[PDB]
Amino acid sequence: HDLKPTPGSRKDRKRVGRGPGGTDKTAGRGHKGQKSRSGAGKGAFFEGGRSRLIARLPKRGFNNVGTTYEV
Amino acid sequence: PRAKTGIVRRRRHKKVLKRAKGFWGSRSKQYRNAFQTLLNAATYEYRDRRNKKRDFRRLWIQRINAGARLHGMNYSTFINGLKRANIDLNRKVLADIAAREPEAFKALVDASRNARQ
Amino acid sequence: PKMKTHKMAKRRIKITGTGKVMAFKSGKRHQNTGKSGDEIRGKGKGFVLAKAEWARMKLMLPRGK
Amino acid sequence: AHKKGVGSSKNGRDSNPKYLGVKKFGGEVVKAGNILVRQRGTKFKAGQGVGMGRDHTLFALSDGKVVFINKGKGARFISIEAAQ
Amino acid sequence: KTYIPKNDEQNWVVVDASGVPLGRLATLIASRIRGKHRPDFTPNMIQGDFVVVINAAQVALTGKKLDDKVYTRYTGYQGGLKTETAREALSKHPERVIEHAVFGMLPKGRQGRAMHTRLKVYAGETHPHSAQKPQVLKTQPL
Amino acid sequence: IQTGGKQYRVSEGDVIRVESLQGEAGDKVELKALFVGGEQTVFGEDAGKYTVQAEVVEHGRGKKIYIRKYKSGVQYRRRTGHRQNFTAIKILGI
RNA sequence: AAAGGUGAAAAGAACCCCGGGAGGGGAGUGAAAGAGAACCUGAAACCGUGGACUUACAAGCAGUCAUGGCACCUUAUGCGUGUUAUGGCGUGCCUAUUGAAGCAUGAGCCGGCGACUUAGACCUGACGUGCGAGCUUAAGUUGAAAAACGGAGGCGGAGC
RNA sequence: AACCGAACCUGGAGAUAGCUAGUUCUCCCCGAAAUGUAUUGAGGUACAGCCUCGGAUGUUGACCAUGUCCUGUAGAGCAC
RNA sequence: GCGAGAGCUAACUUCCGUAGCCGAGAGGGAAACAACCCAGACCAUCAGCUAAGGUCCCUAAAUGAUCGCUCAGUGGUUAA
RNA sequence: GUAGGGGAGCGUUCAGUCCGCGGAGAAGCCAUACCGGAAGGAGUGGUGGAGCCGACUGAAGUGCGGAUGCCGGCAUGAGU
Ligand SMILES: [Mg+2]
Ligand SMILES: [Mg+2]
Ligand SMILES: [Mg+2]
Ligand SMILES: [Mg+2]
Ligand SMILES: [Mg+2]
Ligand SMILES: [Mg+2]
Ligand SMILES: [Mg+2]
Ligand SMILES: [Mg+2]
Ligand SMILES: [Mg+2]
Ligand SMILES: [Mg+2]
Ligand SMILES: [Mg+2]
Ligand SMILES: [Mg+2]
Ligand SMILES: [Mg+2]
Ligand SMILES: [Mg+2]
Ligand SMILES: [Mg+2]
Ligand SMILES: [Mg+2]
Ligand SMILES: [Mg+2]
Ligand SMILES: [Mg+2]
Ligand SMILES: [Mg+2]
Ligand SMILES: [Mg+2]
Ligand SMILES: [Mg+2]
Ligand SMILES: [Mg+2]
Ligand SMILES: [Mg+2]
Ligand SMILES: [Mg+2]
Ligand SMILES: [Mg+2]
Ligand SMILES: [Mg+2]
Ligand SMILES: [Mg+2]
Ligand SMILES: [Mg+2]
Ligand SMILES: [Mg+2]
Ligand SMILES: [Mg+2]
Ligand SMILES: [Mg+2]
Ligand SMILES: [Mg+2]
Ligand SMILES: [Mg+2]
Ligand SMILES: [Mg+2]
Ligand SMILES: [Mg+2]
Ligand SMILES: [Mg+2]
Ligand SMILES: [Mg+2]
Ligand SMILES: [Mg+2]
Ligand SMILES: [Mg+2]
Ligand SMILES: [Mg+2]
Ligand SMILES: [Mg+2]
């Protein structure tokens, strides 16, 4: 029981909500919007609904594993 | 493990409620309306600390003007009179002289109208 | 769940030694008789993305390749 | 009672901005190939050390320090004179 | 720590409104009533002096103020706006002109209404208050 | 007859708390008069010449006070403690 | 669907009083009936009895400040506690909004239940720790009021 | 089988919900934005712009003066 | 507010430029009053000076001074 | 000082360890003018009748006024 962990080893987590301390009402999330909502999804490579950068870029060459030499 | 509310909510509540005695009707018996009344009370407390400092100055000034005019002097002329003769009195104090001690206030009057001449 | 690799980004993006991200310049498939010959030359090529676009690509292929 | 239109505009239109004018001003250091004026015409004529693309763009040829020559209106020249 | 006194006095004084401009007399009276002029002055108590008014009927009014100065009452029923000119008010019931001005110049809550009391208007030369032996106060700017 | 920014009224043999003064239990503090609490009266320079004498009686922490601030429809609540330190002072000036 | 609790032990209250009864007051038992079978504690809303100070000329988001009156004295004779009279001052809360006392939303009241989490041996930073040009095991095996083994694998090591 | 432009029961099922509500303990520090372009996009989202924390630099920023170059508005003018 | 378009040189109008404020700003003033004028609130005080704005009574502070003006309640809302 | 970022903490259950209380009476409940910068924390007294505080450490079903939220009790309308 004598022992204690290192200062800065363990930060206590974020408990969002829990009063005007504190992150009041909206728990970081901001006001309204798709970002506000609670669902699993967007995800990460979704820009606008637009037409994605990666989709606009030219593909080059096939793919081959070949042999790799250990240096 | 689970952790019910047990005991905390009622303690908070009683705290508010016990701040709130003497409040009219539900304002002193229902938690929410207590807590609420109390927010507005907050405003009123802070404000009125500053404001009572505003109010008492006023009072002193009233009394001073009165005494001033008993002996045929306006207040403003009485106060430049005092600053001229470099008498340096609080108006709290000036009021109390004016109200409590007649002859003395009189003396300050004569000194001030002299400083005016 | 192991984060998957964004297969679109396979043939169009490159990781670098330092840790920047590359791709090939664009407009080279029927915008030709334009031309100009120095454009056509300058386009078939390759190049580094401006910057804002780096994080996403990095997240596209976790293995770098 | 109410109305039903019908008119419109034939207008609206304009063209995306053409960021023109001088980019390099009087008394400014200059790397080789730094651009100094974007212009529609011969507004600013090349002097010594400055060449001129087809855009009538003036770009400096050999480093140095920028100098403006206004030869009495409508005939003006920009040049580079190196320091020392 | 600042002085709060005790209402001991009941001070009574007689003002003659004869030949005096109405508003000004109204100020002298109103003020003597409210308390200011009293070095001790304390607001949440009424410390004013009792004020008898005489000769209200001879009050001065800066021309052409009679025929033009209008007082307005309202009754609650439609078409209730009843109006009467200074001259009219002054012949019918002068005391109510003085009362009306002075009452305008007191506060309007509980305490002020309570202050109306210590006003006692009479028109003409005499009053019934000689038992209070009130002390006379001159109309002056001072 | 003044300290921490503010005049006070003294006569003789009276305790008075003022803001915290340097010193300790039994210390002595002299003060320049502003006005003579008595006969013929004196004020101004004549008063400053006369002097006042007073023993530091005690150090104290003033009555507690909470500090509440509030602003509507902002979720702005502020609760804070407060205590105002003073020094109690018996008087026996000339 | 809701539902739980006399007492250590039924010793579950013989008998007397009012009442048709219900209910209660005694007595007796019990350590305690301040545990009596509508039986552990028994908060709040909400309903009443009694007492203090108060209110029948009064315009009010009900507070807040200041003072006076009465009352009271177990963190209490002062920085008081309760209560009040009068003056000054004062547009409920939340949400949503360019803008809320708004005649915009929600809400009878109080009590309880009630909302940013878990997972992977994933990704990427901050902090910390152990080893350090190296670092680490997974399944599993054995042991197991503990842990040890286990190098398969994975990460660095060179880029283009 | 007391509400049928497709009955009712259970299940998929915590369907989806760029929408509306709601989001609970305290103090201290800094502190925005409602602009740009792009979007089957217009009350949504991507990237900039603006906020904060940390690590780097080390006066590079700020204002104001001096110097120098750029300008076609105010006015005015009628040379087209 | 200033600079323009649109609009009827209308709108508590619409769309841009620009400064400031509100937004997210309490305090004094403008009766009341996001925006205007003064002014950016760490806490305590029954202390002193000022800003805009004010000093007959409600209401803190000159029923101030001197030279004039208006007599119409103009003051206390419009024009040919 | 709003969204938001950052910092130091208060309180709740359970867990390990230490301290240690408790029928000469625990937790819970009730009153209160004391304490702390705030979450909050003690002193005394009344209740109750068998369990529990403090400290350090660990893990959470961990803190409510809102959701026409859910269950429950009791008000208003009304002696209508
Ligand atoms: Mg935080
Ligand atoms: Mg809320
Ligand atoms: Mg919301
Ligand atoms: Mg002040
Ligand atoms: Mg408000
Ligand atoms: Mg707001
Ligand atoms: Mg029976
Ligand atoms: Mg009663
Ligand atoms: Mg009356
Ligand atoms: Mg009465
Ligand atoms: Mg709206
Ligand atoms: Mg907003
Ligand atoms: Mg309403
Ligand atoms: Mg409403
Ligand atoms: Mg709505
Ligand atoms: Mg309703
Ligand atoms: Mg590290
Ligand atoms: Mg049918
Ligand atoms: Mg659902
Ligand atoms: Mg499904
Ligand atoms: Mg700041
Ligand atoms: Mg929005
Ligand atoms: Mg961004
Ligand atoms: Mg510089
Ligand atoms: Mg012009
Ligand atoms: Mg508009
Ligand atoms: Mg403001
Ligand atoms: Mg204001
Ligand atoms: Mg006002
Ligand atoms: Mg407005
Ligand atoms: Mg001035
Ligand atoms: Mg006055
Ligand atoms: Mg702050
Ligand atoms: Mg424990
Ligand atoms: Mg327990
Ligand atoms: Mg509720
Ligand atoms: Mg309803
Ligand atoms: Mg219900
Ligand atoms: Mg009846
Ligand atoms: Mg009825
Ligand atoms: Mg009936």
DSSP label at D29? B
Nucleotides of G under 7 A from a protein CB: 43-46, 57-59, 61-68, 79-80, 82-90, 92-97, 100-101, 109-117, 119-124, 126-129, 157-160
Q: How far apart are the first and last CA of chain A?
A: 51
| Backbone φ, ψ for residue D36 (5° rounding) | -125, -30
Q: From the CA of E99, how many Å to the nearest CA of chain B?
A: 25
Structural contact between residues B91 and B65, judged by C-beta atoms closer than 8 angstroms: no
Sort D58 into a burial class: Cβ within 10 Å, 0-12 / 13-18 / 19+: buried
Cα–Cα distance list, E32 to E102, E140, F21 (Å): 11, 13, 46
Report the half-sphere exposure of B81 (CA within 13 A, side-chain side): 18
The whole-angstrom separation of Cα D68 and Cα C26 is 40
Other beta carbons less than 10 A from residue A57's beta carbon: 19
Subunits close to D (at least 3 CB pairs below 8 A): none
Other beta carbons less than 10 A from residue C8's beta carbon: 16
Q: Give the angle A14-A15-A16 at the CA atoms, nearest 5°.
A: 100
The whole-angstrom separation of Cα C11 and Cα C63 is 14
Helical pair B31-70 and B102-116, crossing angle rounded to 10 deg: 70
| Backbone φ, ψ for residue F61 (5° rounding) | -110, 115
Residue written as token pair 């200074």: E86
Cα–Cα distance list, B13 to A30, B27, C7, F60, F76 (Å): 30, 13, 59, 33, 20
Compare CB distances from B85 to F6, F44, F70 and report the shortest one's residue.
F44
The β-bridge partners of F91 are F54
Structural domains in chain D (count)? 1
Other beta carbons less than 10 A from residue E41's beta carbon: 24
For chain F, what is the radius of gyration of the CA atoms? 19
Q: How far apart are the first and last CA of chain C?
A: 20
Q: Which residues form the domain of D37?
A: 20-84
Distance from residue D34's CA to nucleotide G48's C1', rounded to whole Å: 96
Is beta strand C21-23 parallel, antiparallel or unpaired with respect to C14-15? Answer: antiparallel
Q: Give the angle F89-F93-F12 at the CA atoms, nearest 5°.
A: 70
Task: Establish if D56 belongs to a structural domain.
Answer: yes
Which residues of B spanning 58-117 put their CB closer than 7 angstroms to strand G? Answer: none
Structural contact between residues B117 and F34, judged by C-beta atoms closer than 8 angstroms: no
Subunit contact F43:B89, Cβ cutoff 8 A: yes
Is beta strand E50-54 parallel, antiparallel or unpaired with respect to E119-121? Answer: parallel
Residue A28 CB in 7 A reach of strand J? yes
Looking at domain C1-65, its CATH architecture is: Irregular (4.10)
Nucleotides of J under 7 A from a protein CB: 1-9, 11-14, 16-18, 28-32, 34-41, 55-66
Say what the resolution is, in angstroms.
2.9
Helical pair B91-100 and B102-116, crossing angle rounded to 10 deg: 120
Residue written as token pair 């509030």: F70
What dihedral do alpha carbons A64, A51, C43, A61 form, nearest 10°?
Answer: 10
- Give the E-state strand segments of chain F in sequence order: 2-3, 6-7, 17-19, 28-32, 51-61, 65-71, 76-82, 85-91
Q: Where are the domains of chain F?
A: 1-94
Q: Where are the domains of chain C?
A: 1-65
- With contacts defined as CB-CB under 8 Å, which chain F residues touch A24? 75
The whole-angstrom separation of Cα D9 and Cα A45 is 41
Residue B39 CB in 7 A reach of strand G? yes
| Backbone φ, ψ for residue F27 (5° rounding) | -40, 170
CB pairs under 8 A, 24+ apart, for F41-46?
Answer: F41/B103, F41/B104, F41/B107, F43/B87, F43/B89, F43/B107, F43/B108, F43/B111, F44/B85, F44/B86, F44/B87, F44/B88, F44/B111, F45/B86
Contacts of E128 (CB under 8 A, 6+ apart): E122
Report the half-sphere exposure of F39 (CA within 13 A, side-chain side): 1
Distance from Cα A26 to the centre of ligand 1, integer Å: 13
The whole-angstrom separation of Cα D42 and Cα D56 is 7
DSSP label at E130? G
Task: Please identify among residues 37-66 of chain B the ones whose CB lies closer than 8 Å to any CB of chain F.
Answer: 39-43, 45-46
Task: Establish if D36 belongs to a structural domain.
Answer: yes
Sort D1 into a burial class: Cβ within 10 Å, 0-12 / 13-18 / 19+: exposed
| Backbone φ, ψ for residue F2 (5° rounding) | -125, 155
Contacts of B66 (CB under 8 A, 6+ apart): B98, E36, E37, E38, E39, E40, E41
Sort F53 into a burial class: Cβ within 10 Å, 0-12 / 13-18 / 19+: middle
Q: Assign D15 to helix, strand or coil.
A: coil
- With contacts defined as CB-CB under 8 Å, which chain B residues touch F2? 90
Q: Could you tell me where the DSSP H helices lie in E9-131?
A: 22-34, 65-68, 86-92, 95-104, 110-116
Both tokens assigned to A46:
């979704």
Is beta strand D58-60 parallel, antiparallel or unpaired with respect to D50-52? Answer: antiparallel
For residue C15, give the amino acid letter.
I
- With contacts defined as CB-CB under 8 Å, which chain A residues touch F76? 20
Q: Give the angle E63-E64-E67 at the CA atoms, nearest 5°.
A: 130
Q: Give the angle C13-C18-C23 at the CA atoms, nearest 5°.
A: 20
Q: Assign F76 to helix, strand or coil.
A: strand
> Which among B59, F64, C54 is positioned nearest to E42, based on CA atoms?
B59
Q: Where are the domains of chain B?
A: 1-117
Both tokens assigned to B90:
């609080």
Subunit contact A63:C11, Cβ cutoff 8 A: yes
Distance of CA E22 to the CA centre of its chain: 10
F71 CA: nearest nucleotide by C1': I26
Task: Establish if D68 belongs to a structural domain.
Answer: yes
Sort B47 into a burial class: Cβ within 10 Å, 0-12 / 13-18 / 19+: exposed
Residue written as token pair 């309204």: A32
For residue E66, give the amino acid letter.
L
